[PDB]
Design an enzyme around this catalytic site. Structure first.
Site, mmCIF file in Angstrom:
data_model
loop_
_atom_site.group_PDB
_atom_site.id
_atom_site.type_symbol
_atom_site.label_atom_id
_atom_site.label_comp_id
_atom_site.label_asym_id
_atom_site.label_seq_id
_atom_site.Cartn_x
_atom_site.Cartn_y
_atom_site.Cartn_z
ATOM 1 C CD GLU A 95 156.710 13.150 -9.162
ATOM 2 O OE1 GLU A 95 156.273 11.981 -9.210
ATOM 3 O OE2 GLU A 95 157.173 13.755 -10.153
ATOM 4 C CG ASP B 266 154.518 15.384 -13.397
ATOM 5 O OD1 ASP B 266 153.542 15.118 -12.665
ATOM 6 O OD2 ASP B 266 155.472 14.597 -13.561
ATOM 7 C CG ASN C 135 158.513 13.498 -14.078
ATOM 8 O OD1 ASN C 135 158.332 12.334 -13.739
ATOM 9 N ND2 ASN C 135 158.644 14.490 -13.200
HETATM 10 O O1 LIG Z 1 158.080 10.080 -11.129
HETATM 11 C C1 LIG Z 1 157.788 8.983 -10.615
HETATM 12 O O2 LIG Z 1 158.615 8.093 -10.321
HETATM 13 C C2 LIG Z 1 156.316 8.717 -10.365
HETATM 14 C C3 LIG Z 1 155.925 7.531 -9.753
HETATM 15 C C4 LIG Z 1 154.547 7.181 -9.638
HETATM 16 C C5 LIG Z 1 154.190 5.816 -9.049
HETATM 17 O O3 LIG Z 1 155.069 4.930 -9.121
HETATM 18 O O4 LIG Z 1 153.095 5.671 -8.463
HETATM 19 C C6 LIG Z 1 153.596 8.110 -10.172
HETATM 20 C C7 LIG Z 1 154.116 9.299 -10.768
HETATM 21 N N1 LIG Z 1 155.420 9.594 -10.864
HETATM 22 C C8 LIG Z 1 153.216 10.501 -11.249
HETATM 23 O O5 LIG Z 1 153.813 11.104 -12.387
HETATM 24 C C9 LIG Z 1 151.770 10.051 -11.633
HETATM 25 O O6 LIG Z 1 151.183 10.675 -12.476
HETATM 26 C C10 LIG Z 1 151.278 8.886 -10.920
HETATM 27 C C11 LIG Z 1 149.957 8.422 -10.786
HETATM 28 C C12 LIG Z 1 150.034 7.257 -10.073
HETATM 29 C C13 LIG Z 1 148.895 6.337 -9.777
HETATM 30 O O7 LIG Z 1 149.191 5.158 -9.506
HETATM 31 O O8 LIG Z 1 147.736 6.807 -9.841
HETATM 32 N N2 LIG Z 1 151.355 7.007 -9.763
HETATM 33 C C14 LIG Z 1 152.125 7.980 -10.266
HETATM 34 CA CA LIG Z 2 156.249 12.150 -12.131
#
Ligand SMILES: O=C(O)c1cc(C(=O)O)c2c(n1)C(=O)C(=O)c1cc(C(=O)O)[nH]c1-2
Ligand SMILES: [Ca+2]
Ligand SMILES: O=C(O)c1cc(C(=O)O)c2c(n1)C(=O)C(=O)c1cc(C(=O)O)[nH]c1-2
Ligand SMILES: [Ca+2]
EC number: 1.1.2.7
Lengths: 69, 571, 571, 69
Positions: free
Chosen positions: B171, B297, B255
């Site tokens: 992100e 995403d 993603n």
């Molecule tokens: O693109 C990334 O590096 C990244 C990292 C993380 C993370 O490490 O918590 C999440 C996400 N994306 C995101 O796509 C996602 O759906 C998400 C949910 C969570 C959670 O712990 O509930 N982390 C993350």
């Molecule tokens: Ca993500």
């Protein structure tokens, strides 16, 4: 663009109707700054050097120190 | 290493977050079964003294248990003979600013173990190896730089003398990579990036030799315009799997960045890819891109489950995986052959289907995303029909019990610049329940699947998303925690709920189990958070906040509040 | 009011923090008893989503439970038919700076109830009345000003159409007072100060007529030099008791300020006083000063327990109280006559004894405090041999089960100026275990007492101070929570431990009990904090920090971490 | 100073040996600033006025408002 028309194996992207094949020069040009783009690589290079130093010192001294210099 | 193998082969121990090398997240412990689960009660509990989302689950090595918290990532060692005494603890000193670059709550998915050491990371990017008995730090190295938006949340993964660790931050335009370290010294062995040159991605000479149509060389740059791949995402923050015989480990890359698809034309390889890499060299034997040119995403980091089952009568070494995109994938784990690609729920509309011959999703333009257009009723939503939950597999009935999300969305991107250290999303969303719930308001499901056909056996609906995952124990029970605060046990045959307990807060990790002094125990973390709880955790009320998640989960705070700890149950 | 009376007379309800008007903190519920307590198990739990010390206990009105947290003082209403749904909640918006003027952790001792309203306060000084069913705020008024160091922590107390509320802040020179408000409108009826003119202190025309030697008129200023009484302390942040027939409410006023005794020569009346005041006018019928010219911070705010027992065979209306100074007091609650004044532990050395005829402590100069001198091995310490814990009384065996502290100290004062809004302590302490523990390290005791003689019946030692107090239920059980995280049940006959459960964090409140649909439930808050937990809560390590508390409780963090919530148990 | 020598009923304080009967003018003189000493009373006066207004406004309007002015 249904993803089934590939110009090459593993390369099936197509611009959507009404969108450009290349964004450079278009209203969607991201205009990314070259130096800014290289920030991650620059950070990793410095980081790798700091770790290398910690690893080297730990091996020669027998004790691991995170802050060594 | 050999020590980890010893623990893996110790009845009642739990040295790996996913339940074992194949990550089937199950257990042969059958003391607790369908006939007596109604008699299960709380044994003891332990607070971490930290709030925010508490993901993952504790580890049990011998007669010792290791508990972990959300940021600042504290570790607590307890001897099961007396859970009241904290044998040793490690409470990291980290800059509070670290939290500002964490996209989805300050979560931590767990600890790992190897060579008599507890392998733990910190959100600020440090990876450490601590003596499992004294807590002494043997080594501490930097893996990610928060200053460029890179942090650590996933659980480390130990295989032989290697520790696999991947940074989070897509992100924020972080270019993903699986970093490999020496278990004994912390020395960097190599890192395999998700985008860029073949050398940086580390592709074997025979990469995808069994499926050339998947794409082979030069695509890490050719499927991007210019240097857009440098900030192309692909981070792997999910889970891994490992096959000792093949010496291959598996995982999915995330993603591509930004969320604005118009800003990155091309298939964007190798983001959204299922990998089969040699453990020693990190060289990829095969790689299958599930979602070319992501537009939703659908971070492809979900759990990889290795099983050996007959496919139409023929025994096959498999890898199964339920992606954020709503597709259940089953591939031959030796060569990457695509065997199954079915929708986990008929609501999935981003693709008409996944073509098994071309190996790519047959995209439906009506549900794509693009600049100057607001896509509507797109399923799955960015939260996916499956997220970071760890599911379980019952080897007897050969069934996977999946914790699914039933959430769809509206999406419109917008232009934005990239600045290292700043978020790089570029999209506004609205999220809401999928169309198939009994009252059309349900957002969670526990759905049983046959991995060789991708067909469902039964479904149990939940008010909120089944975020943490499920655990399967031989007594014929499917255990799972809910976002509203319950730990539950279902009859694995039909999904009928047989037991439940109201924990202090919602659970976002998957249950674990172990044995001590001839008794089976079930352990579950509690403390709601993660993406679903951002509204509650950060006092947000704007429905579009949390990238649409706030609106979708607006009712959660009427059922639970924050917390942080572990609850253990037994007969 | 009449509505509160209705709840008080409702079997299984718990509308008053101290268990009833007499504050005996007991219950006739006997479903759980000595023979079956071993089968008690956790029923459900609820996290407040707040850390820091969680004092007090929830209220149960009809089929609804009301839970409260530490600062920011959140209120959660639950219908017992579904603990998973938060019917309504009140989350105060308060300036973070409020915490800076709170001496002993940001604790809250509980809610009150009257006229169909939940009466709650906020640390920032606001007192509110919320509809018990909807949570709607009927009135909200200011009671204390944090800008001058005055905050709210004690539970409000409702009697007839009056709400009694006292501000905290003696460590900041706050002049104490019991403020009275109209239950229906929140209007100020009057306030009775602890120091100053008799008019301001509100003394009846026949004040102490039964015991003139206690002192009567003009002492609120005569026992001070100049205007020192203006910043003289005497805050009441403990508990109250009320006798409907006599229309008298009882409570104790706190310590004089500053801690430096040399800066305030004189008896410092009426700080450290046991009061008997008319509820309607606030006029004191009697007042007994337990500790003239305090030199040890023996804040006289502890629980007042009203009982009717035979003294030497003669039925008498009594008031009993165990002060921080280590003396167990029993007085005639009608006229204030002193009947019992015995040391709760022989280690008490600040006084040789309390003279029943002169009515004052016979001071031992060896353990006094004074400028340019370091007093050593003084017992009790400032934490007292009894603090904010709420004890229980068994009407059958006529026994009080006291949660005591066994901590002594070294103390040296020093000069400092008074500046409204800043701390005004003026003393450096070192605190450590008392001399009588089995291994000389124990700091807690559950000790049973006969209130008519002051003699102990039995003792159970605890590693840490018994801070929260005890609850007595007719099944013959003494329930209490420990700082290290356990809820325990003892045989009231000998103190034998019959049951225990490891809660997530140490408990600093006293247990409560109620009935719901045919079953008796036991409720206990968890979340360590308060004075004993300052080291752990505020990341302090200097032994002298927390005014000596940090060193004394240095080992607590090796047994528990912070938390915040409620755990409920039943058969 | 054992607390048993009272100059008057309820007034038994005595200076300890080596300490003064009155601290004003001594090395233990607190030298309190009257302005600071009176701050609590001043605050209560203003606070009582604010509450009175809230009570009056609620009575006349029928609805309770904390911020009324
Ligand atoms: O693109 C990334 O590096 C990244 C990292 C993380 C993370 O490490 O918590 C999440 C996400 N994306 C995101 O796509 C996602 O759906 C998400 C949910 C969570 C959670 O712990 O509930 N982390 C993350
Ligand atoms: Ca993500
Ligand atoms: O003088 C005061 O107004 C005042 C207030 C408080 C409080 O309200 O927490 C405590 C005390 N003193 C202090 O004497 C004390 O022992 C204490 C312990 C605690 C606690 O909750 O653990 N509060 C307080
Ligand atoms: Ca005090």
């Amino acid at each position: 663009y249904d993803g089934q028309n590939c110009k090459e194996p593993g390369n099936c992207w197509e611009n959507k109707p009404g969108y450009p094949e290349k964004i450079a020069g278009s209203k969607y040009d991201p205009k990314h700054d070259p130096v800014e783009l290289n920030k991650q690589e620059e950070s990793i290079k410095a980081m790798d050097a700091r770790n290398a130093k910690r690893i080297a010192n730990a091996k020669s001294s027998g004790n691991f120190v995170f802050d060594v210099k | 290493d050999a020590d980890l193998d010893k623990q893996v082969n110790t009845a009642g121990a739990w040295p790996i977050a996913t339940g074992g090398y194949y990550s089937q997240h199950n257990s042969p412990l059958a003391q607790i079964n369908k006939s007596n689960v109604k008699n299960v009660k709380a044994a003891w509990s332990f607070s971490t003294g930290v709030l925010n989302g508490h993901e993952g689950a504790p580890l049990v090595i011998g007669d010792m248990m290791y508990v972990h918290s959300a940021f600042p990532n504290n570790t607590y060692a307890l001897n099961l003979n007396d859970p009241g005494k904290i044998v040793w603890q490690h409470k990291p000193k980290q800059d509070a600013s670290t939290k500002a670059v964490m996209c989805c709550d300050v979560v931590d998915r767990g600890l790992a173990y190897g060579a008599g050491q507890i392998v733990k990371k910190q959100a600020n990017g440090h990876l450490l190896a601590l003596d499992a008995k004294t807590g002494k730090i043997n080594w501490e190295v930097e893996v990610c730089d928060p200053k460029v938006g890179s942090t650590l949340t996933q659980a480390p993964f130990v295989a032989k003398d290697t520790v696999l660790m991947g940074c989070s931050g897509a992100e924020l335009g972080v270019r993903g990579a699986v970093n490999a370290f020496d278990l004994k010294t912390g020395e960097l062995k190599w890192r395999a990036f998700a985008t860029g040159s073949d050398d940086s991605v580390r592709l074997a000479k025979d990469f995808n030799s069994a499926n050339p149509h998947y794409g082979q060389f030069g695509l890490g740059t050719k499927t991007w315009e210019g240097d857009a791949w440098k900030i192309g995402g692909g981070t792997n923050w999910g889970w891994y799997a490992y096959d000792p015989k093949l010496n291959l480990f598996y995982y999915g890359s995330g993603n591509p960045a930004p969320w604005n698809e118009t800003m990155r034309p091309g298939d964007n390889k190798w983001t959204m890819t299922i990998w089969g890499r040699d453990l020693d060299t990190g060289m990829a034997k095969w790689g299958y891109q599930k979602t070319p040119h992501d537009e939703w995403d659908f971070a492809g980091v979900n759990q990889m489950v290795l099983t050996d089952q007959p496919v139409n009568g023929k025994m096959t070494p498999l890898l199964s995986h339920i992606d954020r995109n709503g597709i259940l994938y089953t591939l031959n784990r030796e060569n990457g052959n695509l065997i199954v690609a079915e929708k986990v729920d008929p609501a999935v509309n981003v693709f008409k289907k996944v073509d098994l011959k071309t190996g790519t999703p047959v995209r439906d333009p009506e549900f794509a995303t693009r600049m100057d257009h607001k896509g509507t009723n797109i399923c799955p939503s960015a939260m996916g029909f499956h997220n970071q939950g760890v599911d379980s597999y019952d080897p007897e009935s050969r069934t996977l019990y999946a914790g699914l999300n039933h959430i769809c969305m509206d999406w419109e991107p917008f232009m934005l610049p990239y600045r290292a250290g700043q978020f790089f999303v570029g999209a506004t969303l609205a999220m809401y329940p999928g169309p198939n719930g009994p009252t059309k308001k349900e957002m969670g499901q526990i759905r049983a699947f046959d991995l060789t056909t991708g067909k469902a056996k039964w479904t149990k609906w939940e008010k909120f998303a089944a975020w943490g995952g499920t655990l399967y124990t031989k007594g014929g029970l499917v255990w799972y925690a809910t976002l509203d605060g319950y730990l539950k046990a279902l009859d694995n045959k039909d999904g009928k709920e047989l037991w439940n307990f109201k924990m202090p807060s919602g659970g976002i990790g998957s249950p674990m189990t172990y044995s001590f002094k001839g008794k089976q125990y079930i352990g579950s973390m509690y403390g709601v958070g993660g993406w679903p709880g951002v509204g509650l955790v950060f006092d947000l009320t704007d429905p579009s906040a949390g990238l649409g998640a706030v609106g979708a989960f607006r009712e959660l705070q009427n059922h639970t509040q924050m917390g942080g700890g572990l609850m253990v149950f037994s007969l």
